Amino acid sequence: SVTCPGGQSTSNSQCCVWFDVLDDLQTNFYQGSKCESPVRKILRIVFHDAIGFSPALTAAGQFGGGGADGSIIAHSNIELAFPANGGLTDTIEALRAVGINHGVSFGDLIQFATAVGMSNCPGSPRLEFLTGRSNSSQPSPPSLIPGPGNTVTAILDRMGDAGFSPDEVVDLLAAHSLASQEGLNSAIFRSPLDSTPQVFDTQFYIETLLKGTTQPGPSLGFAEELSPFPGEFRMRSDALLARDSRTACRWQSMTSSNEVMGQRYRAAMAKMSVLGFDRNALTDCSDVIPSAVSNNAAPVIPGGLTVDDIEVSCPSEPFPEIATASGPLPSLAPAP
Ligand code: HEM
Ligand SMILES: *[C@@H]1O[C@H](CO)[C@@H](O[C@@H]2O[C@H](CO)[C@@H](O)[C@H](O)[C@H]2NC(C)=O)[C@H](O)[C@H]1NC(C)=O
Ligand SMILES: [Ca+2]
Ligand SMILES: [Ca+2]
């Protein structure tokens, strides 16, 4: 059966080169298989690469984008000029080098580095990984990336054109559980979007629902809203989506189970990884992806706050029974 040069066993011979890029990335790009800034930047990158895909542009006789084709690396010179692609240069160049050095397509590489980065963060599911996307790409059309100051209708329409339902938009946002911002408000560099920027968990959903009480920096930044405790940043699109009637019940259902949240995120991400491709034409190499350590902590309403502080926005389903903590309000340190 197929054992690779290193003795590991896989489903197909096309998977063997990925054990090598797995060692490179873990040792170098992830600095000893860590869950820090490199994993966070790659998650913005996989999204901005795959979402440059528009059926509506195709239908209007215009090039609509190749989707998850790695065009953000190949055509970095035009894509990184886009409003949503700031602060990605250093990460795009380190990935370009692993791509050229191992002979793999940029589109596959972005998807692989996402599944490998996530396995370094506790609580993560094992993402599916498929190989075989062609390395040729055209530059993505401009303006296909949702922005933090857009209304909910604008975000749902763009995402709906790419193929996601309102529920999948909420599911995809579980990645803001491993997140911070650097360019919305530079005065509070790397301010976390939830209290556990290194744990893939339910806290992001709970904490964006909390009453915005605190201005974390000396002034408000682009599309910044008051957050529930010092050090945490709250982005206007995340505040709006937690509260809008079209997405509020899915958002609420994500607050109490890390199992359900992970299951749904893995499904939405498998769908995003093949935008512009035929899944059936790719080779499954998911067994190359290692398991992440399990997260054993239970969901909590932090720092003494209670259900009275969460702005319940699903008129049908009552808010889940989530534990409370007898804390003083936390002050979050920048994400590492
Ligand atoms: C509804 C659309 C979304 C909007 C408007 C949005 C917007 C943003 C913005 C403005 C930032 C801050 C970047 C910075 O200044 O450093 C951010 C960070 C982040 N976003 Fe999103 N996001 C959305 C969806 C997603 C999706 C689907 C993913 C990927 C699965 C993603 C992954 C991340 C991650 C992990 C970070 C943290 C980056 C870091 O800490 O350096 N986002 N997002
Ligand atoms: C994928 O396509 C890109 C070109 O778009 C290739 O990238 C170049 O590779 C050469 C050496 O192989 C480098 O010296 C260039 O600087 C690279 N250009 C860019 C824009 O990165 C890449 O080699 C191709 N990969 C595969 C597996 O065919
Ligand atoms: Ca692309
Ligand atoms: Ca988290």
**Which one is catalytic: 40, 41, 48, 250?**
48
246 lines ligand 2 (CB under 6 A): no
Q: Is-contact 54 162, C-beta < 8 A?
A: yes
Amino acid letter, 120:
N
150 & 290 share domain: no
275 & 258 share domain: no
Q: Is position 217 within any domain?
A: yes
d(CA 89, CA 105): 19
Q: Is position 317 within any domain?
A: yes
For residue 273, give both structure tokens: 């990884």
Cα 286 versus chain centre, distance: 19
Cα 40 versus chain centre, distance: 7
199 & 285 share domain: no
> How far does the centroid of ligand 4 lie from the alpha carbon of residue 205, in Å?
9
How many distinct structural domains can be found in the chain? 2
117 & 167 share domain: no
Query: Which residue minimizes the CA distance to atom 5 of ligand 2?
Result: 74
With H, G, I as helix, E, B as strand and everything else as coil, classify residue 28: helix
74 lines ligand 2 (CB under 6 A): yes
The verdict on whether residue 71 carries a ligand-binding annotation is yes
Query: Which residue minimizes the CA distance to atom 36 of ligand 1?
Result: 179
64: alpha, beta or left? (left if phi > 0; alpha if psi -120 to 50)? alpha
Ordered alpha helix ranges (H), 191-324: 203-208, 236-243, 248-253, 258-272
DSSP string, 67-88: SSS-HHHHTHHHHTTSGGGTT-
Domain containing 38 equals 12-145+269-296
Q: Is-contact 191 233, C-beta < 8 A?
A: yes
Distances (CA, A) of 115 to 43, 46, 72: 9, 10, 18
Q: Is position 2 within any domain?
A: no
> How far does the centroid of ligand 3 lie from the alpha carbon of residue 102, in Å?
20
To test the ligand 1 pocket, which listed residue (35, 44, 51) has its Cβ within 8 A of the most ligand atoms? 44
Cα 289 versus chain centre, distance: 17
Q: Of 108, 159, 122, which is closest to residue 268 (Cα–Cα)?
A: 159
180 lines ligand 2 (CB under 6 A): no
d(CA 329, CA 336): 21
Q: Is position 3 within any domain?
A: no
84 & 125 share domain: yes
150 & 203 share domain: yes
Q: Is position 5 within any domain?
A: no
229 & 132 share domain: no
24 & 107 share domain: yes
> How far does the centroid of ligand 3 lie from the alpha carbon of residue 275, in Å?
9
d(CA 51, CA 66): 9
205: phi then psi, degrees, rounded to nearest 5: -60, -40
141 & 277 share domain: yes
Instruction: Please report which helix (H) or strand (E) contains residue 287, including its range.
Output: none
Amino acid letter, 37:
S
Ordered alpha helix ranges (H), the chain: 16-24, 37-50, 55-59, 71-74, 76-79, 89-102, 106-119, 152-162, 166-172, 203-208, 236-243, 248-253, 258-272
Amino acid letter, 173:
L
d(CA 98, CA 250): 38
48 carries an active-site annotation = yes
The verdict on whether residue 33 carries a ligand-binding annotation is no
Amino acid letter, 50:
A
CATH of the domain at 131: 1.10.520.10
233 & 254 share domain: yes
CATH of the domain at 222: 1.10.420.10
Ordered alpha helix ranges (H), 150-288: 152-162, 166-172, 203-208, 236-243, 248-253, 258-272
Q: Is-contact 13 19, C-beta < 8 A?
A: no
> How far does the centroid of ligand 2 lie from the alpha carbon of residue 100, in Å?
6
For residue 40, give both structure tokens: 């966070």
Q: Is position 228 within any domain?
A: yes
47 & 118 share domain: yes
Q: Is position 1 within any domain?
A: no
195 & 82 share domain: no
